[PDB]
Amino acid sequence: PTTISLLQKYKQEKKRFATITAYDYSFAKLFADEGLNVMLVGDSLGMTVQGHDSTLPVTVADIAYHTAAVRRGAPNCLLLADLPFMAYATPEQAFENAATVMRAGANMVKIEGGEWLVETVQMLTERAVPVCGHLGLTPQSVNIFGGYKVQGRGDEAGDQLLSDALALEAAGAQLLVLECVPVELAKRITEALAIPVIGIGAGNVTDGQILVMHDAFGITGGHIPKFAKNFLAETGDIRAAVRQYMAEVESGVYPGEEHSFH
Amino acid sequence: PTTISLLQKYKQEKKRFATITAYDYSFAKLFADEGLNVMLVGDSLGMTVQGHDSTLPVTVADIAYHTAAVRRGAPNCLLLADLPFMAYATPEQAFENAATVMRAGANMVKIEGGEWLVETVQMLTERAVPVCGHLGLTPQSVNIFGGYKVQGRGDEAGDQLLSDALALEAAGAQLLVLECVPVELAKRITEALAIPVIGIGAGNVTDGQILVMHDAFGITGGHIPKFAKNFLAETGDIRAAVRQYMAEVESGVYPGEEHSFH
Amino acid sequence: PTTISLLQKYKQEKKRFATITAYDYSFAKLFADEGLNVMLVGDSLGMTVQGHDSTLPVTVADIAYHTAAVRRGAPNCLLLADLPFMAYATPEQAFENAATVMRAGANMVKIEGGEWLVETVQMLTERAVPVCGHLGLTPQSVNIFGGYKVQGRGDEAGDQLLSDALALEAAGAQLLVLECVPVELAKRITEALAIPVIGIGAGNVTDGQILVMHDAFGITGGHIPKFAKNFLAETGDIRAAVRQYMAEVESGVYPGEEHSFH
Amino acid sequence: PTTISLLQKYKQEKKRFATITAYDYSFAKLFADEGLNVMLVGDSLGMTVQGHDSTLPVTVADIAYHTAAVRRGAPNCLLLADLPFMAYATPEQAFENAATVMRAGANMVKIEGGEWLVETVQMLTERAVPVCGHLGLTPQSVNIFGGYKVQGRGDEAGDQLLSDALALEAAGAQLLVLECVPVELAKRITEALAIPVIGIGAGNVTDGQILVMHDAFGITGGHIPKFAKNFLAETGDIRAAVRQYMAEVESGVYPGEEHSFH
Amino acid sequence: PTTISLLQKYKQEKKRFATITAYDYSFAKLFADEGLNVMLVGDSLGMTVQGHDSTLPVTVADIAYHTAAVRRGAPNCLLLADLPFMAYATPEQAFENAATVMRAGANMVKIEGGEWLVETVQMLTERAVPVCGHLGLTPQSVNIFGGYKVQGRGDEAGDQLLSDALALEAAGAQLLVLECVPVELAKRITEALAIPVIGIGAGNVTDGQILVMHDAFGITGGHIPKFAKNFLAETGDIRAAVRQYMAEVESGVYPGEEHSFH
Amino acid sequence: PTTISLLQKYKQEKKRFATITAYDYSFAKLFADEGLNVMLVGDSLGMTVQGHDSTLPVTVADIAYHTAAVRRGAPNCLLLADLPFMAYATPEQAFENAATVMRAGANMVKIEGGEWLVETVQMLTERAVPVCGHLGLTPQSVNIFGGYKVQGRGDEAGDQLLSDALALEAAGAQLLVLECVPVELAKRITEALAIPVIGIGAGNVTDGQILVMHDAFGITGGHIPKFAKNFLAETGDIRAAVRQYMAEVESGVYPGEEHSFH
Amino acid sequence: PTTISLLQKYKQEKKRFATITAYDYSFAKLFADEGLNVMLVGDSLGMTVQGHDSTLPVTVADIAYHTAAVRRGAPNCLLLADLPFMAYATPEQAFENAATVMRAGANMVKIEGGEWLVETVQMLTERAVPVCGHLGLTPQSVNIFGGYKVQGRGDEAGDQLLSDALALEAAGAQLLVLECVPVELAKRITEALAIPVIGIGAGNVTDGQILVMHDAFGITGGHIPKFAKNFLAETGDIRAAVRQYMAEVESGVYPGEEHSFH
Ligand SMILES: CC(C)(CO)C(=O)C(=O)O
Ligand SMILES: CC(C)(CO)C(=O)C(=O)O
Ligand SMILES: CC(C)(CO)C(=O)C(=O)O
Ligand SMILES: CC(C)(CO)C(=O)C(=O)O
Ligand SMILES: CC(C)(CO)C(=O)C(=O)O
Ligand SMILES: CC(C)(CO)C(=O)C(=O)O
Ligand SMILES: CC(C)(CO)C(=O)C(=O)O
Ligand SMILES: [Mg+2]
Ligand SMILES: [Mg+2]
Ligand SMILES: [Mg+2]
Ligand SMILES: [Mg+2]
Ligand SMILES: [Mg+2]
Ligand SMILES: [Mg+2]
Ligand SMILES: [Mg+2]
């Protein structure tokens, strides 16, 4: 079975690895059959699956529904499940909601934010729940930011994110997702932290990559995000698209400069 | 907004029309944007979405969840939603369950079965719920049949299906799905009924066609049903696949003889 | 306190009377202060208040909420409340749901449909619930009709509405709303029935009129229904618009030919 | 997957087949791995699992719990689940409770009783639920008869059982269990019915056999019933015991004369 | 009845004693009838009974269901019940969930972890709940560890486990389970603690032993843990297997070197 | 295990038998230990246990509570449980409430009333629920009668009770309680029925007797019912008192003339 | 109405007083009629009434049920009600559960334990709940002790109980139950405390006495506890037995040396 141990090993080897979102049996099974064995059941489903204009409406029950479907499709994958908006407002609530998504199939939970989470991370880890951190453009805070804007620009913002990343790691987070930050900051965080750092919109300097699968096969309409690539476009079939994604991540061909912020 | 009126116009014009399954915002919007504006939120999602070995586990709440998602994706489509297993066991229950899915965004409910449903259909239509019939291989009854097997062969079984189709029409059904029957029988039913008849594994003699989108884009693992076609394999991206499907249904190229039973 | 018996009087006197929808304290109080004393808490609120594309999502609790608010603003009005989509699917269900809106402040419930409702109307009236019928374009059935289309054209459809109107009356309906039918049919129904007939898109030949207040008093966007008139445009203030509406109904100036179907 | 189709085929070929009770993953998997592919999740669990002195306390939720566990262990088996005491008192209840156990993983429900069940069976099968009848000794009626004794002795009782068997088959039951009746009667019934008949305490003249697993491995201990055999003996191999049971049923040597009543 | 007082007496006399998991009436009764009077209703049932790939899905209500069953079969046994994943995340939750399993028939609750549980253990005991600790490989933490791996290797690890064992004893725990630890560490802890230490994968140096009964008595099959023994294979019948397990524990023949980690 | 079969044998031997009410473990155990093996968990507990001035407040849940307690005390007794006031108002409700008390440990349910119950009794018995009838002074109807009064005096009332007794027997009732009627009438009913008739206030002409145990040991204050006898008296031994009640029922000494109505 | 103030006066007077358990209307009224005016609705009902082998299954709802019944029988008695197992695990839970039994008719609540309870007792009394303490053999802790064993022997344990007693008093407890301790310890505690101490198995040195009514009339089977006396055997009837109990408590004849521990 694919474990957190394996990703830590890949970091020690400087072997860049691919990860992907998934929300149903069919895609989860397709990814697993191609050897893409790290999947995130993310509250991005609020948008790509449910059709809301933010991730805030997603509930813990919604995550648990999609987590079970993904687990059925990929019984041996490493499965990260988001805790959605206001599902980790106190350590007690975090314990309850983490347990719901883990009992539904997840191996790890992902929660958004910085140093305020330290206690929650320490206590979750102690209670058998592995935690993936999430910094930068954390979409649950879209209303605070006033939009989906690049974070971590400026010495002060950058320095806050570095210290948050170190705090989460010291609290026991075993992975970190870094979203839409300058590549120069992503490199600094990746070098500073012993745990694996998984980037989206953070350039090819991270230890791993994530993408929303709907951007990845041009299912999503309009212009895809700057940081995303349609791998279906130039393979012909979805399985081939998956394999191209895996190989470009490992070689560092993806993300390219065109997919990165500064 | 596409309505049942439009499909009745197409039957009168002998313009064969394509319809497709859909279970989320992203696919629903893609379909609508390409001009495919009849979608079924079917209990097939029990298999393709949830990963069960049959459609039986799918609940009314599941259908409602997926219905609301599809409706956000395709605000103007004609949206058919299945009533799942044991959700129409009595007229009263049918009323309540139909209402749930209609409030969630459906314009019509689809239910499986023949003559025994006549009272239910009459009453539903009085109560503002349009009904699509479903005859032939009705997958909710997979345990009765002992598998997914072709129905309607031989004069007795064929005559009964014709009888059932006319009965459902007389009860107020405004559409009918015929699944996995001889083309010959599909032709008789299509010519006998004034309402539009939508086929899947019924050949190209029906007024319209349906397929599960997961087979259409090659997502599903293994070898696809004889009656299905992977359109993504010949077109290369998903939107062009959708347009090829629309075109080939209209020209009668799909289903071909190879997709048909006798 | 305005009662059904006052309306019945007005018909005997051939005094045409105005009625209006209302969904909150402020407008209800404004209308009452102007002497517009017949209000409908209708499932139109699903669209004009809630913002859905149909009335179907409206619940009995929604109706009861608005009903209480309207009653607080207009303690002496004749208050009709709609039973919404699938809230009267059986007589038992109709009893429970009628009772909820009446306990919340309604004097009378309005239900949509023809002959199939006779038993329900008989039984409701027996159990102390006055009933207003609703024929023609009955908006809960929009999916059956395939849109908001004029009903009652041609001899058969006209004969069915006239017969349905007489059957609801015989069953104990004390009022009837007729919506979007030819004026000539509205005239025949109004003349055939002893109970008052309130028209909307039925021309000026009915005993009374109704309008959604958002259309009447200049709030609704784009092009209001063809049968509606903006009374605020040519009176300047909402109270004057209310008085003009009342006056023009009584004089038969509203609805005009421009607001009428044939 | 083993289906009702396959057992019907076995009857047509005169290939006697084994079936067994199961209530958890570990035993269901052991059985499936030996090719013993028909499993009964019966209310007998009330005694062997729960430890009550009767099956009456067993609930529909209990059956669904055990059903899901057996289905995990044996994904491809034909899984019969009992409806327990008072879970089929009306057709409407039978529909609800049958649906629960089938959604949890059953392929067919087993209900005890004769001719009074005909309507229920007819309506279940319409509504996609296969039914296994159960005649002879029917343990849910223990307080009626005041014990567990051999049924069908004498002409009147025997003729009544044959009549009930034919009536259940005519109503749509696709399988029948006969429990503790004379071999001669079991032969009459098996020969009269086109559907397969599965015996326990009915001798080797039936199409198939059932036993309680807890008796089959000497788990229960004490005096095992006359009709049962401990296959484990002193072999120290449960898998070998299962194989021996399957083989003795197929050859017709189990049940022996010593396990039979006249 | 068998009590904690008895096991404390056994440790004083240096009589090593056998304990076993049980989850139903039939096996509990069998074990009691052979004199094996200490039973654990463990969250191992998630895997052996329910068929999940981990213990995390097991609920408090599941534990309570199986506890009542075992108590029916073994009215006089000492009955330990696990609190499952996240059922003791705070003292208050531990109180509530412990009380549930104790009311259902347990004499004592087992919880996994070290120093962080001291306050919970202290408070549980004040509130009438005896506690069994559990150190070493604690299977609810499978996702933290990344698998089922041997714990306590090296100086820092072994010292920490000794410290935690003494800490749990001082907090009031009356028993300790030690799982998959080097034999030498198990001997250090066993000699340091006054309370009985029960081993699994800890060698024969503990005061007693535990195993999952499905592994021990031949149901799991060829793949049982390294530290387990199939006692049925060499004894022929399940009762004789139970007696052999009891005897070999007491003689120190089981566990052997082949079952032990260093 | 005492069964209805035994009582039926006793009638055939003309061996009169004692029965008693019980509502807790201790008295049930005491009774069982003396061989008083037929107990009623009666809605009389509304008065003797709960302290109400009538039995009407007793709920099904109350009966089930007391039933389980009596069953724990007397595992082998024949245990009748009353369905309380309005717990058998329709056959469907009777099935649900009977099931509840049978699952809690009852072998048979008792319900009050005559011919209007025929369908309920037929259907209960068909669904594995043995029924005891109850005629004469049926205390749930105290408000109808305007108190606790002797029933069946006069030809018309007497004839109706005889008709009712025969009707209930023919419907499938297996026992009948006859309460506070003329001895003369009790003799007719007893001779006319094949099933056993248990008297209270019916004289010594019935097949058996029942009393409220609180009257039977001079626990109840005031003057006890004319028909009751305090067997404890000044003997200082409740067990001796039980044996005396049993002995006097069988010899015919109790009830005496003094305890009888004419 | 008997109050706590009365018992405090009896302690000053050294007038030893009897108390008794009661769980129903009939015994409560009997006790009140004889002037035995202090009653405990104890969790002992778990054994004597419900038939469990310990008091742990008893719920707050059970206490409240029996509490209302006793209050109906004895409107003017001083009514103590136990908080059962884990009903006072935190102060906040104690408040809620104490209020439930007080609203049901209790005047005071009894809770088991020593110094750990001080905050709970202080806060309960502040919030209008009088508290009775309970030390020595506290039956909710049977699993901790390994049975029902005399407590307080030897100086360590004795001194600890005296300390706890004084601590509960200083916290606001208004009464104390002492159970199964040496007589000389009961004397030390009774003399050190200003509040009344009620003994059971504590000898005649306490200010009052408690007995389980089922032991007091020889209802309980077998050989009653050493500290109990069957008062009925020598008095003939239950009221005389109650009067003898009262008298022998006041004279100091009960408990005798034979009912005492050392
Ligand atoms: C896309 C990503 C990795 C960043 O928000 C995510 O967290 C999600 O899918 O929900
Ligand atoms: C595609 C079809 C018609 C197959 O039964 C369907 O109903 C579904 O998608 O659920
Ligand atoms: C608009 C009107 C009067 C007619 O549909 C109505 O019934 C409503 O407001 O809901
Ligand atoms: C084995 C059989 C058929 C006998 O009652 C059964 O029904 C059960 O296991 O519950
Ligand atoms: C397997 C064992 C004995 C050790 O983890 C256990 O705790 C369980 O059975 O759940
Ligand atoms: C004893 C009797 C017959 C009194 O009606 C009874 O039914 C009861 O105890 O509830
Ligand atoms: C009699 C006493 C005081 C002994 O525990 C008691 O608390 C009870 O009856 O529950
Ligand atoms: Mg996310
Ligand atoms: Mg479908
Ligand atoms: Mg309306
Ligand atoms: Mg069964
Ligand atoms: Mg465990
Ligand atoms: Mg009664
Ligand atoms: Mg107590």
mmCIF file of C-alpha atoms and ligand atoms in Angstrom, chain G residues 20-23 40-45 55 82 110 112 134 137-140 177 179 198 200 210-212 227, ligand 7:
data_model
loop_
_atom_site.group_PDB
_atom_site.id
_atom_site.type_symbol
_atom_site.label_atom_id
_atom_site.label_comp_id
_atom_site.label_asym_id
_atom_site.label_seq_id
_atom_site.Cartn_x
_atom_site.Cartn_y
_atom_site.Cartn_z
ATOM 1 C CA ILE G 20 -35.415 1.974 52.805
ATOM 2 C CA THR G 21 -35.159 1.504 49.057
ATOM 3 C CA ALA G 22 -38.342 1.792 47.025
ATOM 4 C CA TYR G 23 -38.942 1.597 43.254
ATOM 5 C CA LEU G 40 -33.929 5.747 48.177
ATOM 6 C CA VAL G 41 -34.570 5.160 44.484
ATOM 7 C CA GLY G 42 -31.278 3.427 44.089
ATOM 8 C CA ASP G 43 -29.403 1.887 41.152
ATOM 9 C CA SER G 44 -29.778 -1.337 43.073
ATOM 10 C CA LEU G 45 -32.955 -1.522 40.950
ATOM 11 C CA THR G 55 -26.007 -1.729 38.725
ATOM 12 C CA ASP G 82 -29.092 7.789 42.804
ATOM 13 C CA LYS G 110 -26.772 10.342 45.865
ATOM 14 C CA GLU G 112 -20.546 7.459 44.807
ATOM 15 C CA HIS G 134 -21.590 7.317 49.422
ATOM 16 C CA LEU G 137 -18.273 -0.451 49.039
ATOM 17 C CA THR G 138 -19.575 1.779 46.189
ATOM 18 C CA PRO G 139 -21.298 -0.796 43.857
ATOM 19 C CA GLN G 140 -20.820 1.194 40.588
ATOM 20 C CA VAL G 177 -24.113 6.624 53.096
ATOM 21 C CA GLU G 179 -21.487 0.744 53.022
ATOM 22 C CA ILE G 198 -26.558 6.283 57.099
ATOM 23 C CA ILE G 200 -25.645 -0.501 55.463
ATOM 24 C CA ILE G 210 -30.604 1.610 54.949
ATOM 25 C CA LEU G 211 -31.840 -1.658 53.587
ATOM 26 C CA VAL G 212 -32.885 -2.970 50.179
ATOM 27 C CA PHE G 227 -25.723 -7.450 56.916
HETATM 28 C C1 LIG H 7 -28.880 0.466 49.302
HETATM 29 C C2 LIG H 7 -27.711 1.274 48.751
HETATM 30 C C3 LIG H 7 -27.457 2.501 49.629
HETATM 31 C C4 LIG H 7 -26.447 0.387 48.687
HETATM 32 O O1 LIG H 7 -25.614 0.626 47.551
HETATM 33 C C5 LIG H 7 -28.019 1.847 47.388
HETATM 34 O O2 LIG H 7 -27.339 2.811 47.022
HETATM 35 C C6 LIG H 7 -29.027 1.357 46.442
HETATM 36 O O3 LIG H 7 -30.024 0.702 46.810
HETATM 37 O O4 LIG H 7 -28.792 1.626 45.244
#
